Amino acid sequence: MVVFEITILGANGGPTEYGTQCFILKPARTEDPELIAVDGGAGMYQLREMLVQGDDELVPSFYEHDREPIEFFIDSKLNIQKGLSKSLLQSLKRQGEHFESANTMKKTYEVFQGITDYYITHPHLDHISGLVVNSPSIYEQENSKKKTIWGLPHTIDVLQKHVFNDLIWPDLTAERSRKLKLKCLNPKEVQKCTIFPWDVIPFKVHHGIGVKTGAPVYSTFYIFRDRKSKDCIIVCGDVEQDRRESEESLLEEFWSYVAENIPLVHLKGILVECSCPLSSKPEQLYGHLSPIYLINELSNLNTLYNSSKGLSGLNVIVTHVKSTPAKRDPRLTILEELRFLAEERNLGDLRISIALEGHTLFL
Amino acid sequence: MVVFEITILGANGGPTEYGTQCFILKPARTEDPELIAVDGGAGMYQLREMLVQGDDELVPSFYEHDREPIEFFIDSKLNIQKGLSKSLLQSLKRQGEHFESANTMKKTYEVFQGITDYYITHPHLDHISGLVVNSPSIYEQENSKKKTIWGLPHTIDVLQKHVFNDLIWPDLTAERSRKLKLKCLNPKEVQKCTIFPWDVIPFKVHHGIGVKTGAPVYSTFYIFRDRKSKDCIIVCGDVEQDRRESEESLLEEFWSYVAENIPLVHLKGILVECSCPLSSKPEQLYGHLSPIYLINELSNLNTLYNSSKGLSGLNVIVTHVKSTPAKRDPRLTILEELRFLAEERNLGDLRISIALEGHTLFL
Ligand SMILES: [Zn+2]
Ligand SMILES: [Zn+2]
Ligand SMILES: [Zn+2]
Ligand SMILES: [Zn+2]
């Protein structure tokens, strides 16, 4: 039944600077070296950690305890494992002697060369820092695996002008070998992934406004659909609720598309933020979701599917939780708040988990 | 004799994305909460690690071994300790009960609020990623400690246009409370630090050329001078040797200034890159130093000081070493190559160490 393997490289919303948003995707079970990244925060560094670290598992927290039981953060039915998947690792183990002789750094370069394509949601630095700093790895060899960075224009235009511009970073897109490329996607259009037999469908969403400019700051939701099984996952960039009159109902458009085109049984997971707990703090919430806003969005999706079973069976994987100087880990607070609000709103057998770095989900 | 405490938050040259360049400075022994940062790669995340991790000490490597003895990377006379200094930690311990009640995350916010001023060498993303992602922490409170980002114009203009621009990052400099400010420094001019009784003297250096534009890419060397003791440290941005005819001898200007104005006995350390080992690889070396180029620069400084004792007693702390898919840790290769070349060039009792994240130097 499992179609997707999702490696959580980074699920941190800030303001600490490591492990920011990046998810690796591949088909379940298969052993090709090729990998897709959604966003570009945590990258090589995190792959290396997972190659070393790989039960009463404890995960980092730094609140009530420095480490906490893994099960506290996840739905009890979630198919999750620590480390990289057996099949991802098998692409290194295709050569017996070579795998054993290769040190951790070498293994990291090898796995990382397989990242063919990034789908970037928006160009905020926390979503691109690993993509950028890791990028010179592409020049380690003559016979070279090339990388492509995909996005809607609001992302690609910014990367071209403000990142790969010989000021913030050497303009690797200008190098004649074209080992790093920027490519635009059209919104709402079914586009094809390059290696996997998957469709990718990007949708624009709102993510606040400029501090100086007041201009809308856009983000992206990506649908990945396995063509054979028709199973899908939704992987989201940072997002806030739409404003009734002053703007386009981008989220309504998105949920309507999902309900029309993807039966709930085929929706294997949504990776979506809840940056903040219910406790106000407007400065930290701008451009983001809190549990009431996320539950309101899921309630809208529920209304569109229009089943008496609610969202029963749906896996919601909560990403981009921010640190806060609070007594309790906000991931735990948010998880409890979301579960409470889902129960209050009668959303059915909805399965809510927090995304945990250094783990793979099987959906 | 020790005047400076230098906390190494990040000394990684890339392409792995965590622990990139950032050094914290404070006067030795004193317990004020205020701190200076040079560069802005590793930040809050690394402070938090150091608050938790704090003998046969092993440090991360990931080559021949995943962890290696600390002493392999340093000169035997180097005054170094793991973790934050006792006096830095004392600023938290001024309140007994409060310190004990505060969790690791809270302690991290508290220490980090003390970073008053950043001195940025150049705006490449690896030198600013932590500064940027950490910056919203400034809005955690009403009665707020404010931060200032200092640099030469080649840095500040780029940060204004390409980073704090509501596209790559919210433009926090436009927020009316002015809790984050960008300020320019004049090159070669003795300027004053805001809290510590220190002079700061910035010098422009070369750091390669644009891939697309061919334009010179500049960097900065910072001299910090304690006015009472007259002791100085030099903390460097990324740099390459000058080209004889085609450009200004920026490095010659710098070493000449040092030899004229700072007696060797007062020069307590230089933190300077050696990104690459002697083994060629032009693509990785562009804009950077290898051991022959670094030793040539130190030889030039030696000639200017003009002593038969060479650079005896000088601490050279090597930063920004890049990963490479090699059998041996390049920090070890580089250390051996530098020591060999220094001996061959008769530079005297020069003390060479690699900068190690998660440690404090006392110079
Ligand atoms: Zn974000
Ligand atoms: Zn964002
Ligand atoms: Zn650098
Ligand atoms: Zn640089």
Side-chain angles (χ1 to χ4, degrees), chain A residues 44-54 84 92 98-112, chain B residues 16 60-67 323-327:
Chain A
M44 286 183 86
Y45 192 105
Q46 189 46 42
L47 289 166
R48 189 174 64 187
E49 283 303 309
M50 296 179 65
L51 290 161
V52 180
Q53 289 178 319
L84 300 164
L92 297 172
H98 187 273
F99 177 75
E100 298 191 349
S101 68
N103 62 38
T104 301
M105 193 70 59
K106 182 62 169 177
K107 291 187 182 89
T108 301
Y109 276 94
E110 289 180 23
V111 172
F112 190 66
Chain B
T16 72
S61 174
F62 307 115
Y63 295 83
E64 291 166 310
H65 305 91
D66 286 342
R67 292 188 315 276
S323 299
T324 180
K327 292 182 177 183

mmCIF file of all heavy atoms in Angstrom, chain A residues 44-54 84 92 98-112, chain B residues 16 60-67 323-327:
data_model
loop_
_atom_site.group_PDB
_atom_site.id
_atom_site.type_symbol
_atom_site.label_atom_id
_atom_site.label_comp_id
_atom_site.label_asym_id
_atom_site.label_seq_id
_atom_site.Cartn_x
_atom_site.Cartn_y
_atom_site.Cartn_z
ATOM 1 N N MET A 44 23.100 18.248 2.683
ATOM 2 C CA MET A 44 24.241 17.333 2.868
ATOM 3 C C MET A 44 24.572 17.059 4.319
ATOM 4 O O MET A 44 24.872 15.920 4.681
ATOM 5 C CB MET A 44 25.509 17.895 2.219
ATOM 6 C CG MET A 44 25.543 17.837 0.714
ATOM 7 S SD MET A 44 27.122 18.451 0.105
ATOM 8 C CE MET A 44 28.148 16.999 0.157
ATOM 9 N N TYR A 45 24.588 18.107 5.136
ATOM 10 C CA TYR A 45 24.965 17.959 6.533
ATOM 11 C C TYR A 45 24.052 16.951 7.215
ATOM 12 O O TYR A 45 24.501 16.090 7.986
ATOM 13 C CB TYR A 45 24.926 19.323 7.236
ATOM 14 C CG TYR A 45 25.565 19.352 8.599
ATOM 15 C CD1 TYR A 45 26.812 19.944 8.798
ATOM 16 C CD2 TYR A 45 24.911 18.804 9.700
ATOM 17 C CE1 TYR A 45 27.389 19.981 10.057
ATOM 18 C CE2 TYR A 45 25.481 18.835 10.967
ATOM 19 C CZ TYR A 45 26.721 19.426 11.134
ATOM 20 O OH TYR A 45 27.291 19.466 12.386
ATOM 21 N N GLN A 46 22.761 17.048 6.923
ATOM 22 C CA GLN A 46 21.801 16.174 7.562
ATOM 23 C C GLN A 46 21.848 14.749 7.013
ATOM 24 O O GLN A 46 21.719 13.785 7.777
ATOM 25 C CB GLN A 46 20.392 16.765 7.465
ATOM 26 C CG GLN A 46 19.327 16.035 8.287
ATOM 27 C CD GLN A 46 19.729 15.703 9.724
ATOM 28 O OE1 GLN A 46 20.337 16.510 10.430
ATOM 29 N NE2 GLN A 46 19.378 14.498 10.163
ATOM 30 N N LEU A 47 22.064 14.605 5.709
ATOM 31 C CA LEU A 47 22.294 13.284 5.132
ATOM 32 C C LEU A 47 23.467 12.595 5.818
ATOM 33 O O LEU A 47 23.386 11.412 6.165
ATOM 34 C CB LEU A 47 22.532 13.380 3.630
ATOM 35 C CG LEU A 47 21.287 13.729 2.813
ATOM 36 C CD1 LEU A 47 21.664 14.129 1.399
ATOM 37 C CD2 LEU A 47 20.283 12.584 2.798
ATOM 38 N N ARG A 48 24.541 13.341 6.047
ATOM 39 C CA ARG A 48 25.711 12.783 6.717
ATOM 40 C C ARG A 48 25.377 12.295 8.131
ATOM 41 O O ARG A 48 25.807 11.207 8.532
ATOM 42 C CB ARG A 48 26.831 13.811 6.773
ATOM 43 C CG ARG A 48 28.160 13.244 7.255
ATOM 44 C CD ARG A 48 29.258 14.277 7.154
ATOM 45 N NE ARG A 48 28.996 15.399 8.047
ATOM 46 C CZ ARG A 48 29.709 16.521 8.099
ATOM 47 N NH1 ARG A 48 30.753 16.708 7.301
ATOM 48 N NH2 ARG A 48 29.368 17.470 8.959
ATOM 49 N N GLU A 49 24.616 13.093 8.879
ATOM 50 C CA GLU A 49 24.199 12.714 10.230
ATOM 51 C C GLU A 49 23.425 11.412 10.221
ATOM 52 O O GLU A 49 23.630 10.547 11.077
ATOM 53 C CB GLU A 49 23.331 13.810 10.848
ATOM 54 C CG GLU A 49 24.096 15.029 11.341
ATOM 55 C CD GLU A 49 25.169 14.690 12.361
ATOM 56 O OE1 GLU A 49 24.872 13.988 13.357
ATOM 57 O OE2 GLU A 49 26.311 15.140 12.169
ATOM 58 N N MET A 50 22.535 11.276 9.242
ATOM 59 C CA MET A 50 21.680 10.107 9.154
ATOM 60 C C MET A 50 22.483 8.878 8.763
ATOM 61 O O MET A 50 22.155 7.776 9.199
ATOM 62 C CB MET A 50 20.511 10.360 8.196
ATOM 63 C CG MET A 50 19.574 11.464 8.678
ATOM 64 S SD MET A 50 18.193 11.818 7.574
ATOM 65 C CE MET A 50 17.321 10.268 7.681
ATOM 66 N N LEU A 51 23.549 9.073 7.983
ATOM 67 C CA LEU A 51 24.480 7.996 7.636
ATOM 68 C C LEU A 51 25.302 7.507 8.843
ATOM 69 O O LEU A 51 25.710 6.348 8.877
ATOM 70 C CB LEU A 51 25.383 8.393 6.447
ATOM 71 C CG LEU A 51 24.711 8.503 5.060
ATOM 72 C CD1 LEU A 51 25.535 9.322 4.077
ATOM 73 C CD2 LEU A 51 24.407 7.137 4.459
ATOM 74 N N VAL A 52 25.522 8.378 9.831
ATOM 75 C CA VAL A 52 26.272 8.014 11.049
ATOM 76 C C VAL A 52 25.368 7.433 12.137
ATOM 77 O O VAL A 52 25.693 6.401 12.726
ATOM 78 C CB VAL A 52 27.061 9.211 11.631
ATOM 79 C CG1 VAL A 52 27.823 8.807 12.890
ATOM 80 C CG2 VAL A 52 28.024 9.770 10.602
ATOM 81 N N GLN A 53 24.243 8.100 12.401
ATOM 82 C CA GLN A 53 23.323 7.697 13.473
ATOM 83 C C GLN A 53 22.680 6.329 13.225
ATOM 84 O O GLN A 53 22.317 5.629 14.172
ATOM 85 C CB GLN A 53 22.248 8.765 13.705
ATOM 86 C CG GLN A 53 22.766 10.041 14.356
ATOM 87 C CD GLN A 53 21.690 11.097 14.535
ATOM 88 O OE1 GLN A 53 20.849 11.306 13.659
ATOM 89 N NE2 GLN A 53 21.717 11.777 15.676
ATOM 90 N N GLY A 54 22.548 5.959 11.952
ATOM 91 C CA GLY A 54 22.027 4.649 11.569
ATOM 92 C C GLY A 54 23.067 3.554 11.724
ATOM 93 O O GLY A 54 23.572 3.010 10.741
ATOM 94 N N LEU A 84 17.925 6.700 7.089
ATOM 95 C CA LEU A 84 17.586 6.527 5.686
ATOM 96 C C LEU A 84 17.000 5.138 5.477
ATOM 97 O O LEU A 84 17.329 4.200 6.211
ATOM 98 C CB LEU A 84 18.826 6.726 4.812
ATOM 99 C CG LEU A 84 19.479 8.106 4.926
ATOM 100 C CD1 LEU A 84 20.886 8.104 4.351
ATOM 101 C CD2 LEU A 84 18.632 9.193 4.280
ATOM 102 N N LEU A 92 23.894 2.685 -2.472
ATOM 103 C CA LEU A 92 25.310 2.702 -2.099
ATOM 104 C C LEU A 92 25.893 1.293 -2.009
ATOM 105 O O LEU A 92 27.078 1.087 -2.278
ATOM 106 C CB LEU A 92 25.498 3.386 -0.745
ATOM 107 C CG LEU A 92 25.147 4.856 -0.549
ATOM 108 C CD1 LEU A 92 25.249 5.186 0.931
ATOM 109 C CD2 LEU A 92 26.060 5.752 -1.370
ATOM 110 N N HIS A 98 33.261 -1.292 -2.277
ATOM 111 C CA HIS A 98 33.269 0.166 -2.374
ATOM 112 C C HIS A 98 32.544 0.826 -1.232
ATOM 113 O O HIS A 98 33.045 1.792 -0.655
ATOM 114 C CB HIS A 98 32.685 0.609 -3.709
ATOM 115 C CG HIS A 98 32.813 2.088 -3.971
ATOM 116 N ND1 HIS A 98 31.903 2.980 -3.539
ATOM 117 C CD2 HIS A 98 33.788 2.816 -4.649
ATOM 118 C CE1 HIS A 98 32.276 4.215 -3.919
ATOM 119 N NE2 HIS A 98 33.429 4.113 -4.599
ATOM 120 N N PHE A 99 31.365 0.303 -0.896
ATOM 121 C CA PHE A 99 30.557 0.819 0.215
ATOM 122 C C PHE A 99 31.321 0.774 1.536
ATOM 123 O O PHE A 99 31.291 1.731 2.313
ATOM 124 C CB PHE A 99 29.244 0.032 0.331
ATOM 125 C CG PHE A 99 28.382 0.440 1.498
ATOM 126 C CD1 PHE A 99 27.664 1.631 1.470
ATOM 127 C CD2 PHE A 99 28.275 -0.377 2.620
ATOM 128 C CE1 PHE A 99 26.862 2.005 2.538
ATOM 129 C CE2 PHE A 99 27.475 -0.008 3.694
ATOM 130 C CZ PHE A 99 26.769 1.186 3.653
ATOM 131 N N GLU A 100 32.005 -0.343 1.773
ATOM 132 C CA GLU A 100 32.752 -0.558 3.007
ATOM 133 C C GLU A 100 33.987 0.326 3.089
ATOM 134 O O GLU A 100 34.352 0.791 4.169
ATOM 135 C CB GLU A 100 33.155 -2.024 3.130
ATOM 136 C CG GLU A 100 31.971 -2.966 3.210
ATOM 137 C CD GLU A 100 32.367 -4.371 3.592
ATOM 138 O OE1 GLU A 100 33.573 -4.690 3.601
ATOM 139 O OE2 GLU A 100 31.460 -5.165 3.891
ATOM 140 N N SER A 101 34.633 0.534 1.947
ATOM 141 C CA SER A 101 35.837 1.351 1.887
ATOM 142 C C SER A 101 35.516 2.842 1.993
ATOM 143 O O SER A 101 36.346 3.616 2.460
ATOM 144 C CB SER A 101 36.625 1.071 0.603
ATOM 145 O OG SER A 101 35.929 1.526 -0.543
ATOM 146 N N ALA A 102 34.314 3.240 1.568
ATOM 147 C CA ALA A 102 33.941 4.655 1.527
ATOM 148 C C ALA A 102 33.694 5.199 2.925
ATOM 149 O O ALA A 102 32.907 4.646 3.691
ATOM 150 C CB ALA A 102 32.711 4.864 0.654
ATOM 151 N N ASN A 103 34.364 6.291 3.267
ATOM 152 C CA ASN A 103 34.125 6.914 4.564
ATOM 153 C C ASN A 103 32.799 7.685 4.575
ATOM 154 O O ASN A 103 32.123 7.795 3.544
ATOM 155 C CB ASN A 103 35.324 7.770 5.006
ATOM 156 C CG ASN A 103 35.612 8.934 4.076
ATOM 157 O OD1 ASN A 103 34.699 9.577 3.552
ATOM 158 N ND2 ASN A 103 36.894 9.252 3.914
ATOM 159 N N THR A 104 32.411 8.178 5.744
ATOM 160 C CA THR A 104 31.113 8.834 5.880
ATOM 161 C C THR A 104 30.987 10.044 4.955
ATOM 162 O O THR A 104 29.944 10.240 4.328
ATOM 163 C CB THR A 104 30.841 9.206 7.346
ATOM 164 O OG1 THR A 104 30.875 8.005 8.132
ATOM 165 C CG2 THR A 104 29.476 9.861 7.490
ATOM 166 N N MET A 105 32.055 10.831 4.847
ATOM 167 C CA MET A 105 32.041 11.983 3.949
ATOM 168 C C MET A 105 31.816 11.581 2.488
ATOM 169 O O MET A 105 30.999 12.190 1.787
ATOM 170 C CB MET A 105 33.334 12.790 4.085
ATOM 171 C CG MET A 105 33.279 14.162 3.432
ATOM 172 S SD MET A 105 32.194 15.330 4.285
ATOM 173 C CE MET A 105 32.933 15.371 5.910
ATOM 174 N N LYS A 106 32.516 10.541 2.041
ATOM 175 C CA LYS A 106 32.362 10.046 0.683
ATOM 176 C C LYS A 106 30.948 9.535 0.418
ATOM 177 O O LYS A 106 30.365 9.826 -0.634
ATOM 178 C CB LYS A 106 33.377 8.936 0.391
ATOM 179 C CG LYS A 106 33.337 8.385 -1.029
ATOM 180 C CD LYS A 106 33.654 9.461 -2.055
ATOM 181 C CE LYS A 106 33.872 8.876 -3.438
ATOM 182 N NZ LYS A 106 34.107 9.950 -4.443
ATOM 183 N N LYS A 107 30.397 8.787 1.375
ATOM 184 C CA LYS A 107 29.017 8.298 1.250
ATOM 185 C C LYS A 107 28.036 9.463 1.114
ATOM 186 O O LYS A 107 27.059 9.383 0.369
ATOM 187 C CB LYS A 107 28.626 7.451 2.454
ATOM 188 C CG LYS A 107 29.332 6.108 2.576
ATOM 189 C CD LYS A 107 28.718 5.320 3.726
ATOM 190 C CE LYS A 107 29.391 3.977 3.956
ATOM 191 N NZ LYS A 107 30.540 4.078 4.895
ATOM 192 N N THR A 108 28.308 10.542 1.849
ATOM 193 C CA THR A 108 27.473 11.740 1.817
ATOM 194 C C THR A 108 27.485 12.373 0.425
ATOM 195 O O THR A 108 26.425 12.681 -0.127
ATOM 196 C CB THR A 108 27.931 12.759 2.879
ATOM 197 O OG1 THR A 108 27.867 12.159 4.174
ATOM 198 C CG2 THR A 108 27.042 13.994 2.871
ATOM 199 N N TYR A 109 28.677 12.588 -0.129
ATOM 200 C CA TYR A 109 28.777 13.054 -1.514
ATOM 201 C C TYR A 109 28.021 12.143 -2.490
ATOM 202 O O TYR A 109 27.302 12.626 -3.356
ATOM 203 C CB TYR A 109 30.236 13.184 -1.960
ATOM 204 C CG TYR A 109 30.918 14.484 -1.578
ATOM 205 C CD1 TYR A 109 31.669 14.590 -0.408
ATOM 206 C CD2 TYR A 109 30.826 15.605 -2.401
ATOM 207 C CE1 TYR A 109 32.313 15.772 -0.067
ATOM 208 C CE2 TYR A 109 31.461 16.801 -2.062
ATOM 209 C CZ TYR A 109 32.204 16.873 -0.899
ATOM 210 O OH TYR A 109 32.846 18.041 -0.543
ATOM 211 N N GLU A 110 28.168 10.828 -2.340
ATOM 212 C CA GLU A 110 27.523 9.891 -3.258
ATOM 213 C C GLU A 110 25.991 9.968 -3.175
ATOM 214 O O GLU A 110 25.312 10.080 -4.196
ATOM 215 C CB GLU A 110 28.036 8.471 -3.008
ATOM 216 C CG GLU A 110 29.473 8.265 -3.452
ATOM 217 C CD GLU A 110 29.985 6.863 -3.204
ATOM 218 O OE1 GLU A 110 29.164 5.926 -3.098
ATOM 219 O OE2 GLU A 110 31.221 6.707 -3.124
ATOM 220 N N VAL A 111 25.442 9.909 -1.963
ATOM 221 C CA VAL A 111 23.985 10.007 -1.814
ATOM 222 C C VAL A 111 23.512 11.339 -2.372
ATOM 223 O O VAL A 111 22.513 11.408 -3.094
ATOM 224 C CB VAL A 111 23.530 9.865 -0.342
ATOM 225 C CG1 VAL A 111 22.039 10.158 -0.189
ATOM 226 C CG2 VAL A 111 23.846 8.476 0.184
ATOM 227 N N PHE A 112 24.240 12.405 -2.044
ATOM 228 C CA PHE A 112 23.810 13.729 -2.421
ATOM 229 C C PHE A 112 23.833 13.989 -3.935
ATOM 230 O O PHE A 112 23.001 14.745 -4.461
ATOM 231 C CB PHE A 112 24.600 14.777 -1.651
ATOM 232 C CG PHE A 112 24.054 16.137 -1.809
ATOM 233 C CD1 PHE A 112 22.798 16.468 -1.300
ATOM 234 C CD2 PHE A 112 24.766 17.091 -2.517
ATOM 235 C CE1 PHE A 112 22.272 17.742 -1.468
ATOM 236 C CE2 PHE A 112 24.253 18.378 -2.674
ATOM 237 C CZ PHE A 112 23.005 18.697 -2.157
ATOM 238 N N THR B 16 29.050 21.254 2.973
ATOM 239 C CA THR B 16 28.002 20.963 3.961
ATOM 240 C C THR B 16 27.602 22.297 4.606
ATOM 241 O O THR B 16 28.416 23.228 4.714
ATOM 242 C CB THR B 16 28.381 19.902 5.013
ATOM 243 O OG1 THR B 16 29.328 20.450 5.933
ATOM 244 C CG2 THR B 16 28.934 18.634 4.362
ATOM 245 N N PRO B 60 34.086 15.782 15.867
ATOM 246 C CA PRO B 60 33.615 15.212 14.595
ATOM 247 C C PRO B 60 34.637 15.335 13.466
ATOM 248 O O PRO B 60 35.381 16.327 13.415
ATOM 249 C CB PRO B 60 32.375 16.051 14.271
ATOM 250 C CG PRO B 60 31.906 16.540 15.602
ATOM 251 C CD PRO B 60 33.156 16.801 16.389
ATOM 252 N N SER B 61 34.679 14.322 12.595
ATOM 253 C CA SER B 61 35.586 14.312 11.451
ATOM 254 C C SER B 61 34.890 13.779 10.198
ATOM 255 O O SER B 61 34.688 14.523 9.237
ATOM 256 C CB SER B 61 36.837 13.486 11.775
ATOM 257 O OG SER B 61 37.661 13.350 10.640
ATOM 258 N N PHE B 62 34.538 12.489 10.217
ATOM 259 C CA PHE B 62 33.793 11.793 9.148
ATOM 260 C C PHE B 62 34.655 11.281 7.992
ATOM 261 O O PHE B 62 34.145 10.960 6.915
ATOM 262 C CB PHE B 62 32.573 12.604 8.668
ATOM 263 C CG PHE B 62 31.656 13.017 9.788
ATOM 264 C CD1 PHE B 62 31.480 14.358 10.097
ATOM 265 C CD2 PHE B 62 30.992 12.062 10.556
ATOM 266 C CE1 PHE B 62 30.634 14.746 11.127
ATOM 267 C CE2 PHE B 62 30.158 12.441 11.602
ATOM 268 C CZ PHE B 62 29.975 13.787 11.881
ATOM 269 N N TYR B 63 35.958 11.168 8.234
ATOM 270 C CA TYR B 63 36.872 10.646 7.229
ATOM 271 C C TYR B 63 37.397 9.286 7.693
ATOM 272 O O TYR B 63 36.615 8.349 7.820
ATOM 273 C CB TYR B 63 37.974 11.655 6.907
ATOM 274 C CG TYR B 63 37.420 12.910 6.255
ATOM 275 C CD1 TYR B 63 36.871 13.949 7.019
ATOM 276 C CD2 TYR B 63 37.437 13.056 4.870
ATOM 277 C CE1 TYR B 63 36.355 15.095 6.428
ATOM 278 C CE2 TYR B 63 36.916 14.200 4.263
ATOM 279 C CZ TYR B 63 36.379 15.215 5.052
ATOM 280 O OH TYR B 63 35.879 16.367 4.453
ATOM 281 N N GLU B 64 38.687 9.161 7.975
ATOM 282 C CA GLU B 64 39.213 7.888 8.490
ATOM 283 C C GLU B 64 38.411 7.407 9.700
ATOM 284 O O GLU B 64 38.171 6.204 9.845
ATOM 285 C CB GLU B 64 40.701 8.011 8.799
ATOM 286 C CG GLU B 64 41.535 8.155 7.534
ATOM 287 C CD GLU B 64 42.951 8.604 7.801
ATOM 288 O OE1 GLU B 64 43.144 9.594 8.530
ATOM 289 O OE2 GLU B 64 43.881 7.960 7.269
ATOM 290 N N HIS B 65 37.990 8.336 10.561
ATOM 291 C CA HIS B 65 37.065 8.028 11.654
ATOM 292 C C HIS B 65 35.984 9.067 11.715
ATOM 293 O O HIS B 65 36.191 10.223 11.340
ATOM 294 C CB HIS B 65 37.770 8.004 13.006
ATOM 295 C CG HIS B 65 38.952 7.079 13.058
ATOM 296 N ND1 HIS B 65 40.200 7.489 12.763
ATOM 297 C CD2 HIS B 65 39.040 5.730 13.371
ATOM 298 C CE1 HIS B 65 41.045 6.453 12.892
ATOM 299 N NE2 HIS B 65 40.333 5.380 13.260
ATOM 300 N N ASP B 66 34.827 8.688 12.234
ATOM 301 C CA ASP B 66 33.761 9.656 12.417
ATOM 302 C C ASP B 66 34.103 10.690 13.495
ATOM 303 O O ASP B 66 33.634 11.829 13.434
ATOM 304 C CB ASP B 66 32.437 8.947 12.710
ATOM 305 C CG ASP B 66 31.840 8.294 11.478
ATOM 306 O OD1 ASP B 66 32.226 8.641 10.337
ATOM 307 O OD2 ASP B 66 30.953 7.439 11.640
ATOM 308 N N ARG B 67 34.917 10.298 14.473
ATOM 309 C CA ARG B 67 35.405 11.210 15.500
ATOM 310 C C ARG B 67 36.906 11.023 15.680
ATOM 311 O O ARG B 67 37.414 9.902 15.596
ATOM 312 C CB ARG B 67 34.676 10.988 16.827
ATOM 313 C CG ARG B 67 33.205 11.389 16.798
ATOM 314 C CD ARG B 67 32.564 11.330 18.180
ATOM 315 N NE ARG B 67 32.921 10.117 18.915
ATOM 316 C CZ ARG B 67 32.309 8.941 18.800
ATOM 317 N NH1 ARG B 67 31.286 8.785 17.966
ATOM 318 N NH2 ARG B 67 32.724 7.912 19.526
ATOM 319 N N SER B 323 34.993 20.594 3.065
ATOM 320 C CA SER B 323 34.936 19.138 2.886
ATOM 321 C C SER B 323 35.431 18.784 1.493
ATOM 322 O O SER B 323 35.413 19.604 0.563
ATOM 323 C CB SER B 323 33.518 18.589 3.032
ATOM 324 O OG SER B 323 32.983 18.846 4.300
ATOM 325 N N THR B 324 35.863 17.547 1.346
ATOM 326 C CA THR B 324 36.291 17.028 0.069
ATOM 327 C C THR B 324 36.069 15.525 0.158
ATOM 328 O O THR B 324 36.120 14.965 1.253
ATOM 329 C CB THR B 324 37.766 17.399 -0.225
ATOM 330 O OG1 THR B 324 38.149 16.868 -1.495
ATOM 331 C CG2 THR B 324 38.708 16.877 0.848
ATOM 332 N N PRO B 325 35.768 14.867 -0.973
ATOM 333 C CA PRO B 325 35.569 13.415 -0.918
ATOM 334 C C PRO B 325 36.902 12.649 -0.928
ATOM 335 O O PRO B 325 37.161 11.840 -1.823
ATOM 336 C CB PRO B 325 34.729 13.129 -2.170
ATOM 337 C CG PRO B 325 35.088 14.223 -3.111
ATOM 338 C CD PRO B 325 35.383 15.436 -2.281
ATOM 339 N N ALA B 326 37.732 12.934 0.076
ATOM 340 C CA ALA B 326 39.071 12.376 0.212
ATOM 341 C C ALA B 326 39.111 11.332 1.315
ATOM 342 O O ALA B 326 38.206 11.251 2.142
ATOM 343 C CB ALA B 326 40.072 13.483 0.510
ATOM 344 N N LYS B 327 40.174 10.530 1.330
ATOM 345 C CA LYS B 327 40.314 9.493 2.343
ATOM 346 C C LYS B 327 40.597 10.084 3.720
ATOM 347 O O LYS B 327 40.123 9.564 4.725
ATOM 348 C CB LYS B 327 41.405 8.493 1.956
ATOM 349 C CG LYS B 327 41.057 7.635 0.747
ATOM 350 C CD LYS B 327 42.149 6.621 0.442
ATOM 351 C CE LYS B 327 41.752 5.721 -0.717
ATOM 352 N NZ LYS B 327 42.779 4.680 -0.996
#
